[model samples]
Target: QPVDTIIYQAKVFDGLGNAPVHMDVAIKGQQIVALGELSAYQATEEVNADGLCLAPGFIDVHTHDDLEVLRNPEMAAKISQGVTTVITGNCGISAAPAELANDAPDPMNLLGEKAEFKFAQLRDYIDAYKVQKANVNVAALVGHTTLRNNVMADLLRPATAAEITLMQQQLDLALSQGALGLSTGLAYKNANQAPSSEVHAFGEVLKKHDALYTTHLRTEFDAVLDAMDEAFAMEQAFDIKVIISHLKCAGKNNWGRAPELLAKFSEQGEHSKCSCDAYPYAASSSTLDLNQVTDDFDIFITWSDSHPEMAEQLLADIAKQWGISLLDAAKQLQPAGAVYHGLNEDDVKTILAFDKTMIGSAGLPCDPHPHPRLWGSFPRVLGHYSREQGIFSLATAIHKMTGLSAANYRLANRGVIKVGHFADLVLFDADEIIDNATFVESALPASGIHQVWTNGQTTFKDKRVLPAYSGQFLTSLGAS
Candidate 1:
């Protein structure tokens, strides 16, 4: 009997956070068939994985690739970094379970235009994925703001019970159809007006399905600690796992608060399930908001609708050229995207190194000049943080990207290399693996990802993409 593929002589990180060991692995069909001393096995393909690091493929736990997956199915930015799975529909925005009667709302527009908001239900996106498969698996989250758009004529007010019932129905259908859980972008004005009771109401549905809740906090600046409290409240309210998307201290005034923030996470985890994710970079990207207008740090405008020519320019420079204040310049560039040089590097390291921390791109894929994390996150974790800085061991870094992520996301049969587990794997040179994509050049691939396989199908190698078809739309399943 022959295996589908056999990889020989590699240091393997099994996603269990244990020390890497030199091992040979065998695969047949979509699952890992055997491991260790596979010298006797025969296979159609045999890979000399000598001097390479073989591990369960990385899981990008936070992303806004809601519509990008359907539009760009090959997913070069993701597969290039050895990411085998992407958890999309992050923040309070997703492509599915939404309908925009007018122009796309604030940050929701970040997902895609009104035309792309075609997924009225989670299954609609799933069905579209079937027609156009990607190079990686997708586990989607239903957006809370998308639900608000469906039932509320006015987003500025708290959701009434009538609107709540309608929203609940839409949410229930998505959960029933396999959405991972609910996500809220309370930081955005579209969801900022939502009362505490409004989101706690979702606990009813989440509890019923045993799904989790992920959120972009209502604030990350001066009120960050308070905002964290708000996030933990959800867990207290429903006993459901909660993930705080892109955890950070967002302003200079709020800098150096990671010790305080992680303490809260530690306190919460003692009782209920709580986890947070962050990218390696200190800068953050999102829709341009007036509230964040500051001279403290440079703001690079990524895209602009009102003033398209102002893009790729520093907000301060744009303001100087326009003979206006940063606030006015920002206002003029309404309906735009900007990257904020927020978060202290010290805080970033502290958070990323925390025990409950999971690595996520939290990357938006639609911008013309996207953040580097969209391309370089996983590699940066392995090469920069773990190896160069010695923030953690290689095994621990792989665990954050693989095992820890899979467990928190409730994705089974993935994120670990084991017999019967899905053959989603990446082989790379540990010494050579480093993220080259930076603020100036956000599109370059990492240095040493040699080959990638998703569910046993070759999708990326030779630093280029391949025709891929084995990606699955994973149903969000967890213990109830």
Candidate 2:
């Protein structure tokens, strides 16, 4: 059948563990209909891929693009980097079914200042995308922490049985409607205060729906091993799929623990179901106050756009500037100040090399001094790590960026190149791809991506955005 578009001379990585193959692909109305020399299908638009790689667009499983998606439906940051789909609603923050504002403790105490909208369920968030034309597909996950706080603000304890039932009911409704899964940030805010019984209660709801339950475990450094054990225990008790968000060890001391953590989990015979996601960087970014730094730990000052002098200064430097000790500097930087870079670079590469792991790019969407991961995550993996150092094969790297991520969210029909698949794809030169955004100098897009397509239409090309808005909202089929 003749099609509206045909892209030829492409190196196709099918995103299903297949190696790149030379072929031509034909598309009609957002569906890939033909591949390999389809001369019979005529097209009004033809893209000469010039043997450049064409694979399913990258799927960012964990991102802070919630506000960014609403503000710029074109999704310039993610889409331009070959991302066609992203799963927002991590760490118990999301915009959804109903906009919620707590009257009890003020929004600042409950969800921090970053959480602007309070939707009751995932449906409300979906409606926002429906009204606006988007360049990338998005999926929602019911945030356990957000719901807990929305229902009981400043309670600072586990939900009672009755409250648990009510929260479960809301989660069930969202999942039935289209939520990708249930997400819990056990490491953040009031959500951290949730007892196992409380988390287990929500786990029951997830298991009933057969949905995945992703967790930012209670600890990532000192108790990382125990955190993994706790996650595994939850999976066993609930019989649900478990995903660890932004899998990484914290601080310089915990550098070599990531591999051991993953290996231990894999050896436990849960490979088919248990998995993890990671951002491709050594230093992670978050609201300074979130960590609640104390005298026990050494902290640095990574970024402070408000105070350019402290942009890349460490905690010691900030303390010196204020003529105080590092402990005081840590306290002052909290609640708002961006934390200094404090991750193990070696651990980052080790985690990325794991087959069960995928890149999540846990970037803040609307921070005043956002992490470079927001703009440079994917490109850094391609240009800095994969292309420059050969840390991972280009094929494996793209898989981590696309297919594995889609699988984590259980998003169907996308994240791969095949006949009868969604036409979310990217064309890039392996040699030229690189991340341009830096901690000190941010606000730049990734470079070397020649073109990007969402739902078979070009969204970005030749370093310019195309006018078309081809993104759509996606729903998870079942629980897991």
Candidate 3:
């Protein structure tokens, strides 16, 4: 049988933590047809990957690219970093199954404006993506906050029994329509008031589908352990898998607590399936929250409707320039975006070094001064953490971003270079690859992503995204 393409003479990582091997990979249509000496096979094209490393394309296990994938279908921010798949609708804010009665509240606005949210059902969102044709494969999760906005008139209070039932109905429909699972942003004001019972009721709806449950904990501060407990309880109640999104210890007060927190995760794993994802950075980004305002660390403004000119400036400097108190300045910049330099470097390393933790950029594309993680997460791990700092082996780093993530999310036939698997792959010069984007140079692409393929189609090469929309919407692999 003739193959469509051949990538020969490359060091392959296979997305598993094994020694690299020189091999040839042949692809036919969307699947890998053979591995090893494929010189005998005829091919339509050939890539002489002379000194490059070939690995399964990175999987961003956590993201908010709900609408960005549709609006910016090229997905240059992700594909540039060799990410072929992104799991969207994280932090309890998805683009689908919603009909915003008013402006999107808080983090939902992080996805897009009210006009961008057109899908009112999970199926509609899936169908829309099929038409939109993103640059990378996408899988979705139903958002708890999105459901609340659709069913309840009030978000500051716990959902009433009737409201819970309505949300459940929507969740059930979304699950049936192939959503991977449910996600909640319990920390956000919109979901904070929802009692454990409210979340537990939703968990029951997921139980029937055997869907996973992911959450942005109620707190990453001093009270994070309690938040972990709350998440564990939900996992236990529904007998479902749980993924903690963008796991981190925020605030100086929470520094050095990752060991204790990870110990708790270890304990929970003995009883239930639980894991986490983390970006390779010390700073975290999100909507500007007055509650996070403090003089302890620098807060860089990303965007603000009330103060658009303040972007890329320090919040304190903005306050000084405005001749007002920092807290007052923060309040004035409501409905905004920020990058908080609120994490301990040691803590960030500890979490990233954990065996079960996956990689998630958590990049908000809408921000004018988006976090560097938006364009740098995967390469930074491969270049800075693994290669520069000696944090882990390259194989381990690749596993975290690929195999472990694909296994955790159940994205079948992806995140590995085994024969017969889908041909989602990346080729790069490991010695030359590193993240170039920083807080100041946020839009800069990484240094050495040589080529990227999604489902056997070359989507990016020569430092450019090819004119191909090869991505697909992946349905759940079903219940763990």
Candidate 4:
């Protein structure tokens, strides 16, 4: 029987960490029908892959694209990098299950303004996504902060017994409606006061559903190890799978701690399922925090609500311009975005080379001077880390972004290239594939992502997004 699409004589990475195979791949409808010598099979569309590499499309394991996917469904930042799936609602800020009564708090504002948040329930959010189809698949986690904001009158203290009960009710409803699990950003002020007991109360709910738990540690600075211990305790208490989001040791004083951190993650894995995700770059982006103001490293302002003209300027330079202290300058730019270049190169390499770590951009799509990782993360792993630095094999790099990520998130039929799997694929030149986006020119598309397809429909090809909204809202496949 003929197929809908065929790519002949390609070097294919099956997303399983094996060696590449030179063969043809056949796709029909939205699934890969066959793989091997398919030269004789007829197809409506065909491509000569030549010396290029074909692999399962990249999956962005962490992102802040909840509103961006609906507002700009084309999603060129992700689709152009050959990403087929994005796991949203990381760092405890989702756009659903609550309507904001006041302005969104720190990181929640990273999604969008208050007007953009309209869904008051997880079901409403999911139903709305089906109406505004996106360019890539989306799977979401219920944000603990969003739940707290909905149920509690005050976020400065631990939730009262009554508030905890109401939050648990909302979480149970969201899980029943297919939320991946729960995500908490304890590092953010809004959730920082929630005692570990309160967090464990929510974990108890996840245990009943056999759901996953992901958290942004309470601290990534001098006390990161303690923060990690807090995260691991949830798994110990509830027997749940835990993912530490954007694992890193921030601050110059905390550099060179990756080895110790990875050792802890390894030691903890003996009793519970634990893993982490890291972006390739050394800098981290998020809302500018007064506690993070320092002269030890360059802090680039991405956006500033009070001082809109300061975007893209270093905090040091901005301070010099205003003849004020760095802390004073940071205060002047209230409710802003920033990129902190505090991580060491050695630490980034150590974390990225860890066998169990996955790749997640953690990109804030709404930042005007968005971190280059927003556009360049996946290809940087492939072209720079794998091909250039020899950090790992190309097959292993693809596996981190594809198969391993899918397994971690329990996203079914979408990460591997197999006969019965979804046909989410990318064709790119091995030698030419490199991230063109930089800190200065952050929005540029990658160089060698020749084509990207989601569920067998060409969403990107020849340097442009195709006119198809093939992306879908995914429910959790099951517990990991």
Query: In angstroms, how far off is 2's CA in candidate 4?
Result: 1.5
lDDT of 2 by residue, 1-480 (tens): 479888888888888666788889888889888889876777888888884778788888887566568778877878767788888767665565434454413222222234546455566667767787689888877777767766775557888788888888888888898887777777765677788788788777787788888888888877788888777877788778888899988865676787787676764444357889888877766656535454444444554544556655666667877998766666665434454456777888888888988888887765655677878888888788888989878888888888887776777788878789889988887778899888766658888888888998889999887757888888878743
Candidate-wise lDDT, in order? 0.90, 0.75, 0.91, 0.90
In model 3, the number of clashes is 0
Task: State which candidate has the highest lDDT.
Answer: 3
Give the TM-scores of the predictions, in the order they appear. 0.98, 0.92, 0.98, 0.98
Q: What is the lDDT of residue 67 in candidate 1?
A: 85
Which window of ten consecutive residues has the lowest lDDT sum in model 4?
Answer: 264-273
Per-candidate Cα RMSD to the true structure, in Å, reads 1.3, 2.9, 1.2, 1.3
lDDT per residue for candidate 1 within 284-394, as digits (tens), equals 998898988899999999999899998889999999999999999999998788999977999999999998899999778878999999999999999999999999999
Error of 1 at 45 (Å): 0.8
lDDT of 3 by residue, 370-474 (tens): 999999999999999999999999999999999999999888999999998999999999999999999999989998889999999999999888858899999
TM-score of 1: 0.98
Error of 1 at 112 (Å): 1.6
Q: Which model is ahead, 2 or 4, in terms of TM-score?
A: 4
- lDDT measured at residue 101 in model 1 versus the true structure, 0 to 100: 88
How far off is residue 212 in model 1, in Å?
A: 0.9
